[PDB]
Amino acid sequence: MDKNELVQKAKLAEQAERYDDMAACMKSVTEQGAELSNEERNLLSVAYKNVVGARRSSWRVVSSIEQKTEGAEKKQQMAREYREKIETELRDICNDVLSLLEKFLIPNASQAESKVFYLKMKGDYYRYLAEVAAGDDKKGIVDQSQQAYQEAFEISKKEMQPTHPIRLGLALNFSVFYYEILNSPEKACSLAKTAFDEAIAELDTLSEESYKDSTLIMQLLRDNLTLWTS
C-alpha cells in the first residue's frame, strides 16, 4: 500500500468515524520511516486522540459508578474489574503511541515545530498513563511526562513565536499537567497566564489566518484560568 494511498484511506476513515482504521493507516505511514508531513502529522494526532479518548471517557464513567456504589459490595467489585480491563486497553494504546514517537517520530523530526509537537505528544500520553498508573509506578511516569513537556517548552521558547499554535497548545496542556497531575494550581495558572500574555503582545504582527488559529487556543487558556481562578 502506497503512503499516499494510506493517507487517503485515513481521511476516509475520519469521515466514517472509524478511528480504529484511521490510527492503523497513520501508524503504517509512520512505520514507512519517512518524516511525516504537517497534514499527515495532524491525521496521526487526531486518530490516536479519538482512539485513546474513548477509553479515557469510559474510564471516567466506570470510576464514577465504582465510587457511588458504597451501598453494594459485588456491584463495586464488578466496576473495579471493568475499570481494570479499560485501563489495560488504554495502556496498550498509549504504549503503541509512545513506541511510534521513540522509534520514528522524535528521531526523524527535522524542524523545531515537529520536535515540540512530538515532545508535547509524548508528555500527553505519559500523562494519560499517569492517570491510571499504580501507586508506586505513578511518580516515575509523572516525571517522564514532565521531562518531555519541559523539553518541548524549552525548544518552543527558543525557536518559536509566542502566537504559534503548537507553542500555545503545549502551554495549555503543560499547565493542565501541573494542575491535575502535580496538583500545582499556582504553577498551572502562572504557566497559562504567561503564555497568554506573551501571545497578546504579538497579536498585531499576525495575518488573518494565523489569527483564528492563535486566538482560538488563547481562549482555551482564558477558559482554563477562569475555571481555576473562579
Binding site: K49, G53, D124, L172, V176, I217, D223, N224
Partner: peptide, 12 residues
Amino acid sequence: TIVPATLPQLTP
C-alpha cells in the same frame, strides 16, 4: 470537578 481544555480536542 469539570474538564479543563486540552489540545487536540474531540470532534465529539
